[PDB]
Design an enzyme around this catalytic site. Structure first.
Site, PDB file in Angstrom:
ATOM      1  N   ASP A  73       0.778  -1.226   0.000  1.00 51.86           N
ATOM      2  CA  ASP A  73       0.000   0.000   0.000  1.00 51.86           C
ATOM      3  C   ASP A  73       0.813   1.281   0.000  1.00 51.86           C
ATOM      4  O   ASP A  73       0.519   2.271   0.689  1.00 51.86           O
ATOM      5  CB  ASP A  73      -0.968  -0.081   1.209  1.00 51.86           C
ATOM      6  CG  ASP A  73      -1.966  -1.214   0.997  1.00 51.86           C
ATOM      7  OD1 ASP A  73      -1.926  -1.894  -0.059  1.00 51.86           O
ATOM      8  OD2 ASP A  73      -2.819  -1.418   1.892  1.00 51.86           O
TER       9      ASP A  73
ATOM     10  N   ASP B 289      -4.712  -0.705  -1.885  1.00 54.31           N
ATOM     11  CA  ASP B 289      -6.108  -0.466  -1.539  1.00 54.31           C
ATOM     12  C   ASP B 289      -6.763   0.098  -2.800  1.00 54.31           C
ATOM     13  O   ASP B 289      -6.205   1.020  -3.375  1.00 54.31           O
ATOM     14  CB  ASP B 289      -6.261   0.555  -0.419  1.00 54.31           C
ATOM     15  CG  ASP B 289      -6.811   0.040   0.873  1.00 54.31           C
ATOM     16  OD1 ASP B 289      -7.024  -1.175   0.979  1.00 54.31           O
ATOM     17  OD2 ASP B 289      -7.027   0.871   1.795  1.00 54.31           O
TER      18      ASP B 289
ATOM     19  N   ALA C 212       0.755   0.200   6.563  1.00 51.46           N
ATOM     20  CA  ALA C 212       1.332   0.542   7.860  1.00 51.46           C
ATOM     21  C   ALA C 212       1.655  -0.758   8.597  1.00 51.46           C
ATOM     22  O   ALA C 212       0.913  -1.737   8.463  1.00 51.46           O
ATOM     23  CB  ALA C 212       0.345   1.387   8.627  1.00 51.46           C
TER      24      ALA C 212
ATOM     25  N   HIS D 197     -10.407   7.092   1.284  1.00 48.30           N
ATOM     26  CA  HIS D 197      -9.012   6.995   0.868  1.00 48.30           C
ATOM     27  C   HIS D 197      -8.883   5.930  -0.222  1.00 48.30           C
ATOM     28  O   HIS D 197      -9.705   5.021  -0.291  1.00 48.30           O
ATOM     29  CB  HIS D 197      -8.114   6.646   2.062  1.00 48.30           C
ATOM     30  CG  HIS D 197      -8.474   5.298   2.630  1.00 48.30           C
ATOM     31  ND1 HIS D 197      -9.497   5.110   3.533  1.00 48.30           N
ATOM     32  CD2 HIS D 197      -7.939   4.076   2.412  1.00 48.30           C
ATOM     33  CE1 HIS D 197      -9.577   3.824   3.856  1.00 48.30           C
ATOM     34  NE2 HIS D 197      -8.637   3.174   3.175  1.00 48.30           N
TER      35      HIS D 197
ATOM     36  N   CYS E 217      -1.927  -3.165   7.490  1.00 46.93           N
ATOM     37  CA  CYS E 217      -1.872  -4.065   6.336  1.00 46.93           C
ATOM     38  C   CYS E 217      -0.514  -4.758   6.222  1.00 46.93           C
ATOM     39  O   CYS E 217      -0.453  -5.852   5.657  1.00 46.93           O
ATOM     40  CB  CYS E 217      -2.236  -3.328   5.049  1.00 46.93           C
ATOM     41  SG  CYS E 217      -3.889  -2.619   4.960  1.00 46.93           S
TER      42      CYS E 217
ATOM     43  N   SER F 188     -15.598   0.696   4.758  1.00 48.43           N
ATOM     44  CA  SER F 188     -14.630   1.128   5.777  1.00 48.43           C
ATOM     45  C   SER F 188     -14.625   2.634   5.978  1.00 48.43           C
ATOM     46  O   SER F 188     -13.881   3.129   6.841  1.00 48.43           O
ATOM     47  CB  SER F 188     -13.213   0.675   5.384  1.00 48.43           C
ATOM     48  OG  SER F 188     -12.754   1.452   4.272  1.00 48.43           O
TER      49      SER F 188
ATOM     50  N   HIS G 244     -10.394   1.012  -3.472  1.00 44.90           N
ATOM     51  CA  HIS G 244     -11.719   1.101  -2.909  1.00 44.90           C
ATOM     52  C   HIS G 244     -12.710   1.766  -3.853  1.00 44.90           C
ATOM     53  O   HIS G 244     -12.403   2.727  -4.542  1.00 44.90           O
ATOM     54  CB  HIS G 244     -11.701   1.923  -1.616  1.00 44.90           C
ATOM     55  CG  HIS G 244     -11.025   1.311  -0.444  1.00 44.90           C
ATOM     56  ND1 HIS G 244     -11.167  -0.012  -0.062  1.00 44.90           N
ATOM     57  CD2 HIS G 244     -10.224   1.898   0.477  1.00 44.90           C
ATOM     58  CE1 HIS G 244     -10.464  -0.219   1.039  1.00 44.90           C
ATOM     59  NE2 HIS G 244      -9.882   0.919   1.374  1.00 44.90           N
TER      60      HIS G 244
ATOM     61  N   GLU H 283     -14.310  -5.399   3.343  1.00 45.89           N
ATOM     62  CA  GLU H 283     -12.984  -4.860   3.640  1.00 45.89           C
ATOM     63  C   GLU H 283     -11.938  -5.961   3.465  1.00 45.89           C
ATOM     64  O   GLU H 283     -12.188  -7.165   3.535  1.00 45.89           O
ATOM     65  CB  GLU H 283     -12.932  -4.248   5.034  1.00 45.89           C
ATOM     66  CG  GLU H 283     -11.569  -3.843   5.553  1.00 45.89           C
ATOM     67  CD  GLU H 283     -10.954  -2.640   4.859  1.00 45.89           C
ATOM     68  OE1 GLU H 283     -10.669  -2.742   3.649  1.00 45.89           O
ATOM     69  OE2 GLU H 283     -10.714  -1.591   5.500  1.00 45.89           O
TER      70      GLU H 283
ATOM     71  N   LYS I 230      -6.916  -4.647  -3.750  1.00 47.05           N
ATOM     72  CA  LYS I 230      -7.770  -5.255  -2.737  1.00 47.05           C
ATOM     73  C   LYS I 230      -8.904  -4.341  -2.259  1.00 47.05           C
ATOM     74  O   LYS I 230      -8.900  -3.116  -2.431  1.00 47.05           O
ATOM     75  CB  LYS I 230      -6.913  -5.710  -1.574  1.00 47.05           C
ATOM     76  CG  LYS I 230      -6.291  -4.600  -0.752  1.00 47.05           C
ATOM     77  CD  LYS I 230      -5.213  -5.258   0.118  1.00 47.05           C
ATOM     78  CE  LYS I 230      -4.251  -4.142   0.573  1.00 47.05           C
ATOM     79  NZ  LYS I 230      -4.951  -3.358   1.604  1.00 47.05           N
TER      80      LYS I 230
HETATM   81 ZN   LIG Z   1      -8.570   1.006   3.006  1.00 46.79          ZN
END
Ligand SMILES: [Zn+2]
EC number: 3.5.1.19
Length: 179
Positions: free
Chosen positions: A9, A51, A128, A70, A132, A59, A53, A100, A93
């Site tokens: 990420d 990520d 982080a 985000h 993740c 989330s 999304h 999520e 993902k």
């Molecule tokens: Zn996320």
């Protein structure tokens, strides 16, 4: 290859000035980029998770979720901040509005792709640490890979939590190295 590098990420919204910034997360970008160059040279598989999304993801705070909006599909916040080779495998993902996915393995074909490429050991870096990165490392352990955490190429949000997560991963058999 027998080894793979998994870059977790490393996206604009998780860097300082983004929508969900990891403190000083930009500080590890030269080292993550260095590992990418190195693994590329060793002829290792390079995987980058992102990520990815949809709007109105579960989330997000607009849905009573924990995080500000985000890494939305096709927006600048979701862009990579690292230098990836053409042959990097991109894992997207948490793309469904009501599901999520913290780990790069959750809801993806990452395990299958790793095995398909004959990978035995995985090196994890990115952000982080306590979220993740941790989840991805523990899931790689599940699937039977030897797992390494790149000490100087991870960053987390709170020192105490980063601290707990590293100690935890080690105890479960994840090896912390740098080179
Ligand atoms: Zn996320």
């Amino acid at each position: 290859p027998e080894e793979a590098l998994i870059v977790v990420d490393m996206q604009r919204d998780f860097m300082p000035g983004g929508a969900l910034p990891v403190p000083e997360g930009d500080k590890i970008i030269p080292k993550v980029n260095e590992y990418i160059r190195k693994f590329k040279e060793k002829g290792a598989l390079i995987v980058a998770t992102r990520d990815w999304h949809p709007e109105n993801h579960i989330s997000f705070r607009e849905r009573g979720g924990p995080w500000p909006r985000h890494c939305v599909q096709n927006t600048p916040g979701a862009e990579f901040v690292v230098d990836l080779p053409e042959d990097a495998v991109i894992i997207s993902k948490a793309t469904e509005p009501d599901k999520e996915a913290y780990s790069g393995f959750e809801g993806t074909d990452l395990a299958k792709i790793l095995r398909g490429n004959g990978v035995k050991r995985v090196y994890i870096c990115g952000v982080a640490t306590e979220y993740c990165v941790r989840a991805t490392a523990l899931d790689a352990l599940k699937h039977g890979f030897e797992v390494y955490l790149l000490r100087d190429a991870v960053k987390g949000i709170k020192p105490e939590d980063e601290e707990r997560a590293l100690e935890e991963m080690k105890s479960r058999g994840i090896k912390i190295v740098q080179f």
